[PDB]
Design an enzyme around this catalytic site. Sequence first.
Site, mmCIF file in Angstrom:
data_model
loop_
_atom_site.group_PDB
_atom_site.id
_atom_site.type_symbol
_atom_site.label_atom_id
_atom_site.label_comp_id
_atom_site.label_asym_id
_atom_site.label_seq_id
_atom_site.Cartn_x
_atom_site.Cartn_y
_atom_site.Cartn_z
ATOM 1 C CG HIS A 9 45.566 73.753 20.566
ATOM 2 N ND1 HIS A 9 43.797 73.438 21.195
ATOM 3 C CD2 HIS A 9 45.450 73.176 20.116
ATOM 4 C CE1 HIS A 9 43.076 72.797 20.221
ATOM 5 N NE2 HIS A 9 44.156 72.348 19.327
ATOM 6 N NE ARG A 60 43.619 75.422 16.932
ATOM 7 C CZ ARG A 60 43.322 75.012 15.504
ATOM 8 N NH1 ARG A 60 43.293 76.717 15.125
ATOM 9 N NH2 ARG A 60 43.227 74.166 14.973
#
Length: 248
Positions: A9, A60
Site C-alpha cells: 500500500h 489502505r
Amino acid sequence: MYKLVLIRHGESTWNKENRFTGWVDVDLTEQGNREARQAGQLLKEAGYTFDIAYTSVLKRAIRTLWHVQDQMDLMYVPVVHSWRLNERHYGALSGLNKAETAAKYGDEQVLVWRRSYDTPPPALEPGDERAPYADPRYAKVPREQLPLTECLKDTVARVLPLWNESIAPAVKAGKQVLIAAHGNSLRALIKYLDGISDADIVGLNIPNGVPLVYELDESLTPIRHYYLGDQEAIAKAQAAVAQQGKSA
C-alpha cells in the site's frame, strides 16, 4: 511462464506518524494516494493488465488498489478482499510510536519485534478495544483463528491458504493477478515463494507503492523478480523504512 505483480500500500497516516499499525484500519495520506496513482501509471505504460486482484480488508491496501485500477482503467475487475492478506498483527504495539518505543526498550528489541521470524510483539488483552472479535470484517472467521498478536511465522501460516486455495489456481488458470497488500504480509508471501531462510528474511524491506513483479515458471517457482520504477527513488524508500531508530 507466468507473471504476478505485488504492491505494498501507499504511505499511510501511521507510516507518516511512524506508528506500528498491524490490523488498525488507517487510511492513506495524500502522498500515499499519489504513490498509488503513480504505480498505476507505471504499470499501464509498461503494458501490464490484470484479470483479478487480491487485497486485504484494510482500506489502505484497498484504496491503493482503487488508485491502480482507476489509472489503469480496470475498475470493473473481480477483487477478492481477504483478511488473510492483512498486515501482520502488531499486538499491544499497535498505535505506539516506533521511535519512542525504541527509546524505551532498546533498538534491538524493536528490531526483533519488527523483523524477526518467530518472536511476537506483546499481545493485546482480549478485551482491548482494538481486538478483532466484534469486527464485521471478521464475523465469519472462527474466534480461535483471530490473532491478538503475530510473529512473521504466523503471518505466513495465515497467508498460505489463500495462495494454495485461490491465488495459485488463478495464476495457473492463466489469470493475470495483482496482489495489493502490506509490508509484512508481503514479506511473508515472498519468504514462501522465494524459499528465504528464517535468518535472511530479517533484512527484506518493501517500500510503499512500488510494483514488484514475480516471473514464475510452470511449477510456480520464481525465475526472477524486479521492482518497476526509479531505482534511486526506491533505495531511498527502503532507507526511510529503516526508522525503528530512537528519537532525542
